[PDB]
Design a protein around this ligand. Sequence first.
Ligand code: HEM
Ligand SMILES: C[As](C)(=O)[O-]
Length: 394
Amino acid sequence: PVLDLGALGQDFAADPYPTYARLRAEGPAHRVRTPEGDEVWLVVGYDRARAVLADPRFSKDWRNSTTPLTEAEAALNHNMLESDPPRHTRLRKLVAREFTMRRVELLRPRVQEIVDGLVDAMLAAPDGRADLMESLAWPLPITVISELLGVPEPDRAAFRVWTDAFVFPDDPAQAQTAMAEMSGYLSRLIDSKRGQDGEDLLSALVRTSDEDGSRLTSEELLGMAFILLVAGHETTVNLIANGMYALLSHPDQLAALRADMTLLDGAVEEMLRYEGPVESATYRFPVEPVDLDGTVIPAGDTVLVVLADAHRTPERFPDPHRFDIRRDTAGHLAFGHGIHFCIGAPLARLEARIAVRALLERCPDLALDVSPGELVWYPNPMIRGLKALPIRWR
Ligand code: HEM
Ligand SMILES: C[As](C)(=O)[O-]
């Protein structure tokens, strides 16, 4: 049959893992209906999930999908995430050097500065309470990626409104309106860099496209700007929030990290394994019918790799539901796997490591200001993210 995820209510949004684990027990592939009404396939189980992410039979070119793209969706579709070789190879080569570890390490001073200033403005609240989402989890990633690509400061507020319509559309028409508004603005921002001799990443991409349209088309230029700004911000925002929630709702681990701050990098890794921002990888389409343990997914269907279930598979991560910052986290799929492995992983780790360190080093007696049952999770089956994260200190 077809399992409707919308009928499971907020209980699925708050804790989807028992539902995924129930499906993994009976097989790897399952037809489900998303809470928004889409019939997709769910791929569960760590071994199957890791394999499907790197399987060329599961394509990312929407030309291989039977699902139609709206005009607004198609306008931002020409990006590396929604591509197979050789288009994916060509597009990622354009910006790969900008996101290496050695190049991202050069941003560490500025990242620390952005974090230090946001922590200051948070600690200036008189009642000693704040929403960590609004005060640090959102401002930090959007500021870093905006300075890298050259988005003016007055333009960054509308990006939260737009991605708020992506992750949680009050009505599907609002997400479409946000996509057209973003597509129009990005085209205006691209045009504004032309001939201005800017040295930001978008200015370099505009010049690259103007010099040789075959290396980077104007649609691919728009798509590149789109994917770099959206895929960077949203996931990093939720990683900071999901991870601080994990530390504050597991006080023994917070104390262990406070005792030995060399476990910081391992704690962030387990943050990604325990409550990674990506619940399911982006849409994949089989170019031919694929047989998964007697279950045959037809060509062109929408396949969702449930990364969250892969991280709760006990044969790969023993005691999966335990948040252990000393755990062996090697081989998690939080950043994906294969040719589409997150190009922003070094930058995201740098942002998360500095943010978590600054919060703990500056604010002892930091605490969650609500009960874990009071937190609200977004009903998006693709995103594991909170509406807010109330905290208090001193
Ligand atoms: C919390 C941190 C992050 C997480 C968990 C994350 C997660 C992911 C995942 C799972 C994928 C592969 C999706 C798929 O296979 O369906 C991906 C791809 C991608 N991510 Fe991220 N990401 C993060 C940070 C970033 C940042 C900061 C940037 C931008 C600077 C970024 C840009 C991209 C791009 C461009 C791709 C497409 C790569 C390609 O197709 O080769 N990500 N990310
Ligand atoms: C800074 As603009 C894209 O509104 O010209």
